[PDB]
Each structure stands twice: as structure tokens, then as C-alpha cells.
Design a binder for this molecule. Structure first.
Ligand SMILES: NC(=O)C1=CN([C@@H]2O[C@H](COP(=O)(O)OP(=O)(O)OC[C@@H]3O[C@H](n4cnc5c(N)ncnc54)[C@H](O)[C@@H]3O)[C@@H](O)[C@H]2O)C=CC1
Ligand SMILES: NC(=O)C1=CN([C@@H]2O[C@H](COP(=O)(O)OP(=O)(O)OC[C@H]3O[C@@H](n4cnc5c(N)ncnc54)[C@H](O)[C@@H]3O)[C@@H](O)[C@H]2O)C=CC1
Ligand SMILES: NC(=O)C1=CN([C@@H]2O[C@H](COP(=O)(O)OP(=O)(O)OC[C@H]3O[C@@H](n4cnc5c(N)ncnc54)[C@H](O)[C@@H]3O)[C@@H](O)[C@H]2O)C=CC1
Ligand SMILES: O=P(O)(O)/C=C/[C@@H](O)[C@@H](O)[C@H](O)CCO
Ligand SMILES: O=P(O)(O)/C=C/[C@@H](O)[C@@H](O)[C@H](O)CCO
Ligand SMILES: [Mn+2]
Ligand SMILES: [Mn+2]
Lengths: 525, 525, 516
């Protein structure tokens, strides 16, 4: 087993709880008309409390359980949990969670006697739940069991699917909420496991509040049937179209709940699942690009004090773009044109073949570089131009299956008329990439539910009571394309910066300062 | 000077005319229900007559003279004609016609004493007009002179544009026909050199027959002002939308001419230019993808006996695709997915940014592989599947200017589950590629106008009188995406096969048989 | 599916086909003034094709246990026995995709509408099918072909398992291992050798005895399976070129003498070729080494045996000649062509050594020189007649048999412009090489049943240059420079099959449409 023991007086343990002192420093800046930056440092002391008693089993309810991601996730959990080795043309392979930052990445704890960097597993600093301990279920408008789902998805090695056949076959998605207008028309035939059916047994968008009540009961039922204490809900179903946000409809906690009861046409299935999970006090993670978290819902989460988070998985082309575009601008290079083409032949691409669904994705896959452009007015300004041409294209090409092909070109300006042209061709099993990210989101969300804190008054000992994270868990931004933010704050998409936040967080809970990379043990005599 | 002298009794010269005997062989095939192919060879003897008196100057009237292709063509002609060397970062460069199959490709005439292949310039077999002898003019809805056109286009080296400044500045496009509905709305501001203006001086699609009469007079005027004997019209203006072909409108020579007089809404500017050139007996070449040659026009060409030809320039991505896809299928490999993405930032891409214009291009850029799939039912059939997923994408990205970036992926099947994935990134100055192809089309069209023939009756000497090529010059298919064909016949897009046709044609006029590649001087003792 | 041409150029005489053919061409000379004098030439011929093809064709592969050898056997068994297999994309049916003789078609003529009619490449004249191949061969490693398959990691696991029972039965015969002719690492792999001394050790002494043993292996294979026709093909690791010296291997008599003299320039492939020639069986060299030294070519001529080869024209080199040719035919001037490649199979491992790779760097390069030379408008002393070119092959084990090829064509356009085409080609190398081997065997067998006479029948000059479509280093007749234009190379084959059934070469003139 891997564990870390930090010798610090900032940390004490009391009844399965770790208490850690932390002085958070930042700075408020102002810019003079002239052009001077006045920086006022700041400080706020805290005491973080970490419940060390992690759950032995964590309930996981996926919406879209029968899809590529859904079936692959269950498969990865079963395969790893039971060490289901499988045959391939490269020979027997041992199951693993490669692609999981939470399960397969490491972090620098410090330097050793010789002065060489020492790294430890990301999940070895503080107690985290293992995906091998996930008890998974969920919903799907299609009733195929999970073995059929695997076959249909064509993601996993034939031999592996066969070894998981027996178990996967017994896993059946619960009927779900199907409202025809929110997803592509071509998914119509797929919908045969719906709870919203009229007297004639047909699909009906009538009775949206009864649906909400069923989903909540589904969560309660699942939990007790498994003797679980905690459950997390994650949406990994078809990308819906955006819903119109309007006053009196979904702008407030009150208008939203009412619109739901009135069956407003701008209440999507995700709106119902989110509202249900929130009302049950269950973390809800949105893995798709639609704007499920309209003002009224966020408001409901804040009021209920329930974790919400998400907006599309940042797994391939966009993940790398949030690394490459950052890199270029940090180097003083000016990207002026970024073309991103994509084609896949799975159900994800089949649904996204329709404009209303594609537009959702198109928006989240573009937003990722906006903050980058904004951070540098030396390169991007009115005099030199502050725009970067950016196009996102997603075409459905059945023959490539789940292996999305991403082709991008970054055309940038260098000094004295020069240019830099970086062409990319990125191929990979989209689900094998996404699945571990879904695992990361659940692992980190669960970790977050066991964290609380309280401001420390310098001139008054033991003031304030512990609070929980502000409802919107921005700490999970690393795994999302369009980071949901707190009202007023702008999102930051820099991948490396998003991971650093997670790193320093774990580091501070065990009493370590943030990474500085100064290495004065070397640079100074 | 380069010239070829073939010792053959099949060729005689009489008063600046070459007379050549040729026995054309082919074969008619039938397929038995059982599955046998009955092949009946055929033969038809001919006597081809080639007018050797090529014109000293060839009139060239481009529609879209002020565009990227138009200005570049005039520039290339001026630069080469006057040996205008220019400065670059790689040093002084000498003008040339690289990219011109007609000016820079060679053909194998035979083998030498040692048995080694001997090649001669494509234009050295028989007298052809030099582009240095082109007298160019034309029309454009924009009045900018050709120097401004060059600056605006940003295709040529700054130093070269400057050396051509004086001459190019004096070249001004003639006002043209602007009908707002046929091209992108964004070209509206560009239109300020129109002949179709009402009393108020505004653009009017009224009086389409007067426009036709003006264009014809334009051709007559241009010709006499330059003391020219021959002129060729070539459309290199914005891609128009397709026009609806309907009975009583543009299905016959008669309905078309009437619709023109009635100002039918399905009579585009290209329809007018084509009709005008045909009525003037001037070859008309369509360098864009719109369906300018509706049944009624082709009928008018046949009746007038005037050369027509075209439908989009096959210059880059599509040219290479007509080589690569052919190659794969000839090798028994089965392409199943071909994704073609493209982005450019010139006016061509700005206009194509609108769906109605893009659809025209999209159709011609796809058609190129249909004949290939059809030729092999071993690979493409009902049992194995006879479809090849193919998508064409064109995005406008201003920062790349005239340097179109073409990205394609050919995903094919190999035996026993294998696949082959060929990714491509093709960059180039689109106009530097297209321009020489426009030059080729004009050079070959002019050559064709000096060719006639007559069937030879074996049992009756001197029967029949000379005829000219069937109106639709399919021999130019090498330079076009969607080869216009004779009613009933299907087009062949194989690039290498298209060039071979041109090669064997020139070869037969000087008394040589088609290339067989048997080399029995080597393979046999 | 069959073809029946109504022509008076072909007469059948009991499994015999006689076809008349006038071969036209032309001889050219150039005047100082720059005038080309062309004199047409014609030579009449009569071809005879023995229509009686073998019902079973013996195939002996040197390197039978490698990627190509094992995949070849698997494809034959899989197709022959319709072994469908499971994949994550579902059940797939076996086929010979990638094979020109089995999966490409040819245009026979036009229909009543004026549109092209195509027929299977192997449907014009009787050709042996790969399903009727009886395969055996040698290998320095004794692993059975099932183990060979697993080792190769070329085929779908389920297909390997469905073929396990049959493939296990196939084991390679011991072979000749002369250490110095290949990459060191191919050492402890050599556990199956006939060349051993009275101590049991691998030796290069007694080369004539080795030769005699290969002939016996060939005779036994024939008798053992009651086969009349057998073809041998080298698909074993690339050897290091041998030096051709006078009296050593410059002639038929010297060559044989040097073999008996255990001469150091007598390579294992040299012996398999000599043995095959003596047994009268066609020998195909699927590797870059210069197996066919002068003395060896004389032996082939003398025995009237067909030889052919010098490296299996791989996909890249194949597509590279096509693109380069295409550019130059369009009047575009490539000025730089860079080729980088990496694979992780034994082939790549063996080529990781300079002497093995060097052989391959010689063949794949010469192809663009033909192109440069074909156009003095673009390539001349005034504008420059050179084209920078580089071929790099690195061993990257992890990519296994899936060779990755990365090329970049940089060309000049008019008035200072440029065209940059960069490619990234990936594929299971052996899934492309296997079918190419099937084509070579099928076409070599066909050529052996063809004889001709100008105007007693004679045979196809030892070197079957007709197979250049599948070989990177086209072996040619003395004095003649090899041609590599893939499309031209396929044209030759197409027209050959056409002339045998009385059809002229394709002209693409389509006068039924172009003329009134
Ligand atoms: N596989 C491909 O795509 C291409 C292969 N080639 C040629 O074919 C050869 C084989 O290719 P692969 O099957 O991929 O390689 P491989 O490495 O799997 O096959 C060679 C292995 O070495 C053994 N071997 C070495 N020396 C031998 C000898 N003296 N007698 C008998 N067996 C011997 C066997 O041939 C064994 O299978 C290469 O070395 C090369 O010359 C050429 C172009 C492409
Ligand atoms: N696949 C990837 O790598 C990534 C996936 N995502 C997103 O995750 C989602 C799922 O992706 P995949 O698994 O590939 O797609 P998928 O189409 O295979 O799976 C989605 C599943 O959701 C079900 N479904 C649709 N609407 C539903 C509803 N209202 N209630 C319950 N079930 C419903 C469908 O029947 C289907 O089985 C999509 O929105 C996709 O864009 C985002 C980034 C990356
Ligand atoms: N540029 C290339 O490499 C190739 C070009 N083509 C086609 O050739 C055409 C021209 O291309 P570019 O020169 O790049 O575009 P461009 O936009 O620069 O030039 C076209 C010119 O035509 C003029 N024009 C538009 N409608 C007109 C009308 N009714 N009458 C007269 N003038 C009119 C415009 O004012 C403009 O100056 C387009 O349809 C393009 O798609 C096709 C294949 C390749
Ligand atoms: O590879 P990315 O840009 O990080 C993620 C991309 C995802 O949106 C895609 O897989 C999407 O679901 C399919 C269409 O491309
Ligand atoms: O490069 P291609 O496919 O041969 C020709 C492509 C031409 O249609 C393009 O330049 C088109 O005008 C612009 C949009 O791509
Ligand atoms: Mn997926
Ligand atoms: Mn252009």
C-alpha cells in the first residue's frame, strides 16, 4: 500500500478526521489610468476538515448507462475489480485504469537525500475511493443490457467483452425520461425504455413533475437495494440542445420548480435529473455540453447545498488544445488561426450529426481558448488585432466507429512576418479516453463531499463553523470543456493550471505549501 | 526550338495542314446472365486534319478577371512574356509556368539506340499556342484595376507585383452582369462595375436579353480592338448557386433563349455569358462548379457547333484524390471512408462560406470517386457493401489567405480485418495552382479548334467530309472536377487516364500508336 | 465469371492458345538543333499459352515462419475454408483485399450506352487461385505456424484461434544460416539449421551439401504432395549485399564452383536460388539483397528457369512513385522529398543493422531518378536538376507490425510558389505484403505457361520484369534501365493480358463520345 506521512504541526487527527491549518494568500490588483498595477496582497487563514472515513462502496448512477461511455465504464470497473485479463493480438493484457489522472498520475512530494524529485500516486496523499468500489447503475432510453451495449458500442476487445459477458448481461439500464425535442430525431427508434408514457403507452412530455418524483425514488431505491450511504449522479447521455433561459421560466429556484410542474417546454430531461439529484442531496455531474445548469437550478443547488458540476468532458482534441494554445501564448507566440476538424462513427457522432446537438458541442469546444487570448494584450489588442479565427467541425463517418479522428491546424505569427504551422492528426478510442475521466470526476467529487472548512479569525480563536465547498465544484474543471463557474467569475481552461489547483489542494491538506519550482537547493550556493 | 519529326506514311502535309490516317479500335462488351463477358472488338478508320496555322495572338476573355485567378493569370502572362525576374528571400527568380501540364510536362516519344526512354515537351509534338501570346481581358462586377486586384489577392511576391505595377494598373475589367441571388450576399459591396442597372442606376435582373447582346458586342469589340482572329471565353468568377432545370424553362435551345428574353429567374449570369459566347461562336469554358450547362444550352452549343466545356477546376485536393483513390482500388484495396476538410481565407472561400455556393463545390469535389467505386464490384457490392463514406468540408479562415489548407483521411480495408489509414495535409497557393490549369484549358481548347476529322469507309475511298469535335470537349476533363459529358455517357475522373487520352491523341496525330508499356525489346529474348 | 473475345487473332488447340500480335514502338534520336526524329517499329509475334493450369500449386517460402510467411498461410487457409472470425466490429468474412490479381478489375470495353465494362483481373485468362496453394518452406526458427502467428501479432486473436488447429500442423523445414549475411540479433532465433558440422555446430563449410539438401527438400515437397508445379519465394530477413567478382560469381560455371569452394560471397539466398533453378522451379526474390548475381542469371537462362524480384515494393514506395509521378506529369517540380518510417516487427529489428537497411536504401531511392530524367523542362542545369531525397527507417518495437510511414513532398509552383504535401500512412505491414506475395506467385505461375516466337516458341527471358509492379528494385536485362512508374507497371500487365485475348492496348480516346 502507498501512503504519505507529513511531519507538520499544521495537521492533527481527531476521530477519523484530519484537521489542517492553512494560510491562503492571493492579491487584489488595480490598474491606474496611467498604466501602473497596484497589487494589494491578501491573506485568509483556514482550518480544513477532512472526513477520513471514505465509503466502502460508492453508488454511481449514470444517465446514458447503455451508451459507449456507460458500458465501457461498467466494463472497466468489473475488469479491474476482478482482474479480468484478456487476449489480444499483442497477447494477454492486464486490466488497468490508464487514462485516469486520479488512478495513474503522480505528484511531486519533494526531494530526497540526494536532492532528486520524489513522486507519489495522486491518490496516495489522502484517502480516496477506488473505482473498483463503484456500484454502478443508471438509466437509458434504450433497454439493451450492458453486454449488448458493449457489442453495439464496439469499443472493447472482443475477447474482453466475452469474458465480461456473463456479468454485463445481468446489468440492465432503468427506464428513463425521453422528450423527443431535446435530442436528434434519429434517436427516436432507440427510445424504448421510457417512464414518461401516456395511457396509450406513448412518449409524453406531460407530467414532468411525476418524472422528477420517479427519478428521486429511483435514487432512493438504488441506494437501499445496495445498502449504500453515498451515491453520485453523472450525465453521460446524448448531447441535448440548449434550453432557452428566460425570466419567469428557469431564472430562479422558484420559477424553475414551477415550470417543471407546468411542463414548460424549456425543461429538458437533464433539467429533471439535475433537479432530482439536487433535491435528493446527491452530487450531479454534467458530462455533456448542453446548458443544464440554468440560473434557477444553480440557485436550487445553492439553496440545497448540493454539489453540481460539469459541462462536457474535456478528453481529447480539446484537452490537448488547452495545452498547446496555452503553451504558444505563454511563449509570446500569437495563434491567429485554429481549425479543428473531427469525424467519428459512433452513436455520439450520429446524434451530433444534427445541428442543434452539434451547436452545443461546438460552443464548448471553442470557448477553451477565450481566456488565453484575453490574458495577453501585448499580442491581442486593437492595434494588432485581438481575434483568433477558430472553427470546429464534427462529421459523422460510420466506418471509423468509436475511434474519433481529430485533425487540427494551429497557424501562428512569429516576429518579422514569420509564421508557425502546427498540423495534428489525433486518433483514439474516444470511449477509452472519456471513461477514465468519468471515473476521475466521480472519485474527486466523492473526495470533495468529505471536505469542509472554516475561516480562521487571527485575533479570535475558534471562530466560525465548518462549511462545505461552494455548490459549483470548479475544482473539477480539469475534466470539463466549458467549466461551470460561480456567478461573476470567469472560467480558466488552462489544463496544467487546472491540475495544479487540484495538486496544491491535496498538498495543503497534508500540510505542504504549493509547488514553486524554485529549487534554491540547486540555484543558490 | 523543340520539334518532332515522325517517319510514317500515315501523315501527309498539304497547305499548312497535316492529314493523318488513324484506325481507332475499341470493343463492345455484353455480360451473360451466367456471368460471361462477350467482347466484340470494333474498328473505325479516320483521317484527322490539323490546321497548322496557329494564331499569333489568342484572345482570352475571363469572367472574374479581377479575382485571384484572373489577376494571377494576367500577371503570369506578362511576367513570362517579358521575362520579368523578381526578388524573393530565396533570391532572384525567373518567371516560369510551373504547374502547367501543357507547358511543363513531357511525353515519351519512344526509346533510343540504347533502349532508354525518350521524352519531349507535351507542346513540342504539334503546334500549340503559347500563353505568352495570350491577349487577355474580360469582365468583373468590381472595377479595381489589375494592380489593385493583385494587391487585394495577396498571391504574388511583393517585389513581382511592384515590377508588374505599371502594366497591371492599365488593365481594367469590363463591367459585367450582376444578379444578386446567384452568389453569396457578402459579395454585394464588391459589385460596382455592372452593366445591368435600371434608370435609377441600380442593379436590375430585368432586361437579360439586352445583357446577352452587350456581352456579345463586348466579344466583338475586344476582338477588333486587338486585331484578333480567335478568342476563348473562360469563367473564373465566384461560384454561383445551381439553377433549377425545368421543362419549358431551360430544357431546350428554344425554351432557354425564350426564358432569357422573359428574364426567367433561373437564368444566371453564367447562363448569359455561355449563351453569348456560343452565339458568337466562341469557345466557353466553365471553371466553376455551378451547372451552367443546362440541357437547353448544350443543345444551343450543338446547334451552333461551338465548343463548350468545364465545371470546376480540378487543381489540388481533388486532383490528388483522383490519383490516390484510383491507386487504392486498382491495387485491390477498399477505401471505406474518405474525409476531406478545407479552409482558406481568400474571396473564393468568403463566397463559398454561404451554403448555396458551397453546395455547388461540395457536389463536384465528391463526384470524383463515384466511377472508381462502380468499376470494382469485387470490393463494392451488396454482399460486402458498395458504399464509401465521403464528406467534404470548406471553412473560411481569413488568416490563411490564398494558401488553402487541405486535410484528408483515406481509411481503407485490407484483408483479414486490417485497415490502412492515410492522413494528408496539403498546403499551397491555390491561385498559383489554378492559374496554370486555366492556361492549359485555353491552350488545349485552341488546339482543338484547329482539329477536324472524317470517318474512313474501307470499301470507299474519300467518303465523308470533315467534322469538328463533338461540342462538349471532354478531352479537357483532366483539368475539371465534374467532367461535363455527352448525353448518355458517364464521366471518368481517373486523372492518369484523362492525361493518357490527351497523350494518345497527340501521339496519333503524328502517326504514333498509343502507349502500351510492354517493352518487348526487354521482356522478350 | 469468364471472358470470350470474338477475334481472328486467337486460335485454340486443345488446352493451347495461339495469339497473333504486332508490337509497335519507335526509336528516337535527337538533333543538335533539338529536333526529335522518330522511327516507328513493328515486330510481329505469336504467343502460345498453355491453358492447362495446375490444380494445386506448390509454394515454398524461405522465411515461412515470419510475419509474411505465417500471414500468407493463414490467408490461404482462411479463404479456402471460409473461416469467418469475430472482431469488435462483428463477424467478418475472409477475403484477399490488397491483392491485384484477386481483388482488382480491368476494363474490357464499353457497353451499348458507351460506358465502361469492367471484369475481374484474373477472369480474362485462367490463373491459379491462392486457395489452391499448397504451402511449405524453410525458416531458421522451428516454431510451428500457429506460434509464428502469435509471435507476429498480425492477425485478429479470434481468427488466430480458429486457425490454431490447422496452423499448428505446419512447421518450417530447417534452413541455411550463414551468420555473417544478416543482423546479429537473428542469432539465438536460429534453432532450425541444416548447415551443421560433425560437431553439431552452425558452419559455412560444405555449401554444396546445403545446395543438395535444398534440392532434395524441393523434390520431397513435390513428391510428398504429388505436385507438378512448385514456385519458391524468398521472404526471409534481408541479407547484406554480396560482392560480384570475376571468376567467383560472374558466370554459371564459376558460381557453381564457388559454391563447392564454400566461397564467402555465396549467401544462403544464393543457394536457394541455385537449387530452385536446378530443380527448374521459378524463384522470386522478395528482399533487397542482390541475390541474382551474373553467374546466377546465366544458370537461370541456361536451365530456362524463370527468376524475378529484388524487394517487395512496399506500400509507401508504391504510393510515393505514384504521387511523385503525378506531380511531375502535371508540370509541378518536386525539389525535396523526405521519407521517414518506423516499425516494430522482426523485419524492422533485422533492418536496424546498417548492412540490412543499406540494401533497402538503394532500391527505394532510384525511383525518383527516372522521374527527374523524364522531364528536362523542370530538371536541367539552368533551373537545377536535383531533388533532395532521404529514406530513414527506425526500429520502434511498440508499433509492432503496424509500420508508420511519414513523407513530405515539397514542390515549386509558378512564380515563386510552393506546394507542401505531408503524409502519414499507417497499416499492418504484412497485410499489404501478404497479398502482394500472392500476386507474385499467381503471375509467375501464369507466365510459366506462356511462350512466344517472332515472325520454335521460346520462353519469357529468365527475368520476369512483368512483375515490377510488386518489386522496389526491378531486376532488368543487361543494358536496360528499370522502370518504376507503378501505373505504367500495371499498364504493362493489363495490356499483356489484353493482347493474349486479342484486345489492343487501352487508348482512352473514347471516340464514341468525343467525335460526332
Ligand atoms: N513484410 C513486409 O512488409 C516487407 C518485407 N520485405 C522483405 O521480406 C522479408 C521478410 O519480411 P517479414 O516477414 O516482415 O519479416 P520477418 O522478420 O518476420 O521474417 C524473417 C524471419 O527470419 C527467418 N530467416 C532469416 N534468415 C533466414 C534464412 N537464411 N533461411 C530461412 N529463414 C530465414 C525467417 O525468414 C523468419 O520468419 C524482409 O527481410 C524483406 O527483405 C520487403 C518489403 C516489405
Ligand atoms: N465519448 C466521449 O469520448 C465523450 C463523450 N462526451 C459526451 O458524453 C455523452 C455520451 O457519449 P457516448 O457514450 O459516446 O454516446 P452514446 O450515444 O453511445 O451513449 C449515450 C446513451 O444515452 C442514452 N440516452 C439519450 N438520451 C437519454 C435520456 N434523456 N435519458 C437516458 N438515457 C438517454 C442513449 O440511449 C445512449 O445509450 C454525449 O453527450 C457525448 O457528446 C463528451 C466528451 C467526450
Ligand atoms: N482558386 C482556385 O484555386 C480554384 C478556383 N476555382 C473557382 O474559380 C472561381 C474564381 O476563384 P478565385 O479567383 O479564387 O476567386 P475570386 O473571388 O478572387 O475571384 C472571382 C472574381 O469574379 C468576380 N465576379 C463574381 N461574380 C461575377 C459575375 N457575375 N460577373 C463577373 N465577375 C464576377 C468577383 O468580383 C471576383 O473578382 C471560383 O468559382 C472558384 O471556386 C475552382 C477550383 C480552384
Ligand atoms: O477530443 P475532445 O475535443 O477533448 C472531445 C471531443 C468530444 O466532444 C467528441 O468526442 C464528441 O463527443 C464527438 C464529436 O467530436
Ligand atoms: O484543391 P481542389 O479540391 O482540387 C480544388 C479545390 C477548390 O474547389 C477550392 O480551392 C475551392 O475553390 C475553395 C474551397 O476549398
Ligand atoms: Mn465515446
Ligand atoms: Mn485562387
Amino acid at each position: 500500500i502507498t501512503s504519505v506521512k507529513v511531519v507538520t504541526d499544521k495537521c492533527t487527527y481527531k476521530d477519523n478526521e484530519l484537521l489542517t491549518k492553512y494560510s491562503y494568500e492571493n492579491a487584489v490588483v488595480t490598474k491606474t489610468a496611467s498604466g501602473r498595477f497596484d497589487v494589494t496582497p491578501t491573506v485568509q487563514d483556514y482550518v480544513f476538515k477532512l472526513d477520513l472515513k471514505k465509503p466502502e462502496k460508492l453508488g454511481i448512477m449514470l444517465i446514458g448507462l447503455g451508451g459507449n461511455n456507460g458500458s465501457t465504464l461498467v466494463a472497466s470497473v468489473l475488469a479491474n475489480k476482478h482482474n479480468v485479463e484478456f487476449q489480444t493480438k499483442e497477447g494477454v493484457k492486464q486490466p488497468n485504469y490508464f487514462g485516469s489522472m486520479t488512478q495513474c498520475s503522480t505528484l511531486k512530494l519533494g526531494i530526497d537525500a540526494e536532492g532528486n524529485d520524489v513522486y507519489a500516486p495522486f491518490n496516495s496523499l489522502l484517502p480516496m475511493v477506488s473505482p473498483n468500489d463503484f456500484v454502478v447503475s443508471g438509466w437509458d432510453i434504450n433497454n439493451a443490457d450492458l453486454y449488448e451495449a458493449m457489442q453495439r458500442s464496439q469499443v472493447l476487445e472482443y475477447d474482453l467483452q466475452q469474458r465480461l459477458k456473463a456479468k454485463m448481461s445481468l446489468v440492465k439500464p432503468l427506464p428513463s425520461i425521453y422528450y423527443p425535442d431535446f435530442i436528434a430525431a434519429n434517436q427516436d427508434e432507440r427510445a424504448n425504455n421510457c417512464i414518461n408514457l401516456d395511457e396509450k403507452g406513448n412518449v409524453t412530455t406531460r407530467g414532468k413533475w411525476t418524472h422528477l418524483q420517479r427519478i428521486r425514488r429511483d435514487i432512493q431505491n438504488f441506494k437501499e437495494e445496495n445498502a449504500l450511504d453515498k451515491v453520485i449522479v453523472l450525465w453521460t447521455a446524448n448531447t441535448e440542445r440548449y434550453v432557452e433561459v428566460s425570466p419567469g421560466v428557469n431564472d430562479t429556484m422558484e420559477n424553475l420548480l414551477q415550470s417543471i410542474k407546468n411542463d414548460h417546454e424549456e425543461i429538458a430531461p437533464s433539467t429533471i435529473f439535475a433537479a432530482a439529484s439536487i433535491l435528493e442531496g446527491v452530487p450531479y455531474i454534467n458530462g455533456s455540453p448542453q446548458n443544464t445548469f440554468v440560473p434557477g437550478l444553480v440557485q436550487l443547488a445553492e439553496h440545497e447545498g448540493t454539489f453540481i458540476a460539469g459541462d462536457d468532458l474535456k478528453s481529447g482534441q480539446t484537452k490537448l488544445k488547452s495545452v498547446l494554445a496555452q503553451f504558444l501564448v505563454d511563449a509570446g507566440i500569437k495563434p491567429v488561426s485554429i481549425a479543428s476538424y473531427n469525424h467519428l462513427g459512433n452513436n455520439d457522432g450520429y446524434n451530433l450529426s444534427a445541428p442543434k446537438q452539434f451547436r452545443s458541442k461546438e460552443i464548448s469546444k471553442s470557448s477553451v481558448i477565450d481566456d488565453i487570448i484575453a490574458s495577453n494584450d501585448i499580442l491581442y489588442n486593437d492595434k494588432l488585432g485581438k481575434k483568433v479565427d477558430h472553427c470546429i467541425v464534427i462529421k459523422y463517418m460510420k466506418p471509423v466507429g468509436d475511434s474519433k479522428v481529430a485533425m487540427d491546424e494551429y497557424y501562428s505569427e512569429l516576429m518579422l512576418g514569420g509564421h508557425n504551422r502546427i498540423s495534428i492528426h489525433n486518433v483514439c478510442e474516444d470511449s477509452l479516453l472519456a471513461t477514465p475521466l468519468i471515473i476521475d470526476l466521480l472519485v474527486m467529487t466523492e473526495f470533495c463531499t468529505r471536505v469542509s472548512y472554516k475561516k480562521v479569525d487571527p485575533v479570535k480563536e475558534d471562530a466560525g463553523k465548518f462549511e462545505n465547498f461552494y455548490p459549483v465544484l470548479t475544482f473539477l474543471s480539469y475534466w470539463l470543456k466549458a467549466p461551470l463557474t460561480r456567478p461573476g467569475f470567469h472560467p480558466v481552461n488552462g489544463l496544467n493550471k487546472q491540475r495544479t489547483a487540484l495538486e496544491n489542494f491535496l498538498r495543503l491538506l497534508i500540510g505542504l505549501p504549493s509547488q514553486n519550482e524554485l529549487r534554491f537547493e540547486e540555484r543558490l550556493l
